[PDB]
């Protein structure tokens, strides 16, 4: 319904001052940081290795 084309419009102008979350500067992001020596090791291999067990 083209109704939604303008419920989008009301949303977008009520948020004109707002930074979208994909452009949010993160204070401290730690995603995809690997320990040294694991350049050739996948996440699954590391999990299967037993070195990173869940409590």
């Amino acid at each position: 319904r083209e109704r939604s084309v303008r419920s989008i419009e009301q949303e977008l102008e009520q948020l004109r001052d707002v930074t979208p979350i994909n452009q949010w500067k993160r204070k401290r992001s730690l995603w995809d940081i690997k320990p040294p020596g694991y350049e050739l090791v996948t996440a699954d291999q590391a999990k299967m290795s037993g070195v990173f067990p869940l409590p």
Binding site: I21, W31, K34, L54, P55
Partner: protein
């Protein structure tokens, strides 16, 4: 033959696979669990050198890093970080997405990734209502059960940060919906 109330309500059971009761993982869910993702600084070699303000800033940074990342898989309705002492819950991160497809896309991507030098574990979770799942003591007063507690000890970020993240996601979602 009786459903494990704790697995289905909280997404975690103190008995693990040794439980006498039924744990069946869903093949579809709006909610995921990344077990033990959150490592509270307090319990680390450095942790007691930090002031309360430093600790609060560190947690806001963690919560932000989580919410912003999970948003890339789809609309995030709620994010809960467990600060329990017990092994079954300590550091558990739960995310409820609007759509089941988001949750599946998330665990498939997350299971191939690392976070702060540890590989990420992610699974679909049976949890449907964080209100039921969260420890009402830990909210209202303090829970003094420690590892005995079977409910989530939700650690909350600065309210302004959460409001800002929700707004930022609303903007992101609106800009995406405006692509057609």
């Amino acid at each position: 033959k009786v459903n494990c109330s704790f697995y289905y309500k909280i997404g975690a059971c103190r008995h693990g696979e040794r439980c006498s009761r039924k744990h069946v993982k869903p093949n579809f869910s709006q909610t995921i669990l990344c077990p033990n993702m959150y490592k509270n600084p307090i319990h680390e070699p450095n942790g007691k050198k930090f002031t309360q303000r430093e600790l609060a800033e560190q947690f806001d940074a963690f919560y932000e890093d989580m919410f912003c990342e999970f948003s890339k898989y789809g609309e995030v309705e709620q994010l809960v970080v467990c600060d329990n002492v017990g092994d079954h819950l300590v550091g558990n991160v739960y995310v409820r997405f609007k759509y089941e497809e988001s949750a599946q896309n998330a665990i498939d991507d997350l299971n191939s990734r690392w976070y702060s030098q540890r590989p990420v574990y992610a699974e679909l979770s049976p949890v449907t209502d964080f209100r039921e799942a969260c420890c009402r003591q830990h909210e209202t007063s303090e829970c003094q059960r420690g590892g005995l507690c079977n409910f989530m000890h939700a650690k909350k970020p600065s309210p302004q940060l959460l409001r800002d993240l929700v707004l930022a996601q609303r903007k992101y979602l609106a800009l995406n919906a405006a692509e057609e």
